[PDB]
Design a protein around this nucleic acid. Sequence first.
DNA 1: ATGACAGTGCT
DNA 2: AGCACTGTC
Length: 430
Amino acid sequence: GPHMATGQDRVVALVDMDCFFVQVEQRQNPHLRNKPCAVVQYKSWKGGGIIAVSYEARAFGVTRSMWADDAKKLCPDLLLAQVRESRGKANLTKYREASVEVMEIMSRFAVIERASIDEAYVDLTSAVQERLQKLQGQPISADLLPSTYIEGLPQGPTVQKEGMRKQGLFQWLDSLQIDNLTSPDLQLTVGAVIVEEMRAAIERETGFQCSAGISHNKVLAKLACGLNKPNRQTLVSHGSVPQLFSQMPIRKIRSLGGKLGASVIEILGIEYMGELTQFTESQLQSHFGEKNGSWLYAMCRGIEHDPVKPRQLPKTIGCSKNFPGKTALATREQVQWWLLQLAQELEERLTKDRNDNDRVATQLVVSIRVQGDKRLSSLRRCCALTRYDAHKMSHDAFTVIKNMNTSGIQTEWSPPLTMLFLCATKFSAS
DNA sequence: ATGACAGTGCT
DNA sequence: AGCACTGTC
């Protein structure tokens, strides 16, 4: 009734750079622009691993995870850009620096949470209030929303994509100006206007295109972002949620794409997010735990409270390398050389981080994987990170893992190592 | 023989 | 603290 919270208190956006690593390489090499293109990591084994794919290449069936030799079978004209290799390993510095470019532009408009190297959540609630004052009750023109889709529209009583988009936007804005929508709907709409301006600034100032979702919380904003790509943005209103969720597979909602989502499907015998509304909160808690149950109860009604955290910078700075199949590290000299390679990249990134961001890491996490273990990590151990010195970090890492060598000799390493991982964590102001 | 990243939550 | 889980390009 009048005491039922509807989760309409915030305006939240999720901005996602379209096939980001590809765009970085296309900006640098114009010959790659507007072509089927992919970014490949390494090159010797089966042509290298594809890690990013342009939308033109996706139309041929090229996907991430694919071996480049296989991608070329689907797309013979596929162009490839190679990830930089330094100290024997893939080095993602170019993409990290490009991400900083975008995040600094986004930070001019609103509070941002860096979700990944190319996604940020945006809390627009305050900016929308400000913009609503300036407008002075003047209606919002469709020209302010030139790339916005309104999910669920058009409805009721053109066979072209852009024409559908405009029809839906007109229906939305017409009902807005007649006062047939709600005050949260107006807030979302102003939020979308700001996101158009943010995306325009990103493209003008970096060359990069992005897509975005605008809704009342992070889960709906992320879901919204994926509905119309590339280079478009989608507004998911609270009212659109029942129809949207009625055929939405549970795995599409963030945090339900793995084992928990699979258990929701199996235990409850349902397929779609909207089907969750038929269970009580206590029922859901009894199957999935207190926290998950409460979260699911609210989420299937379009409600989520997870805040956009004010976090511009990554919380960890890590370096890793796999050694699959025959390349597994089988000797002590190997392990120490590679630990040094990883530690040297980490030292370089850590020193740069300290200069730019006035912070120092205090913990070094060391993880390895041994040949045979089905889990991605076999062992994780931490030690103090007291100096940004690669030779010290590599020695400390060796010290904390050396006991895992169950081999007879000190010169051999068994069972061989299929992964080394160093991660600097626990940052303090400096 | 996807890799190389990253953040959150459990116990 | 060490690990499992979930997500990114």
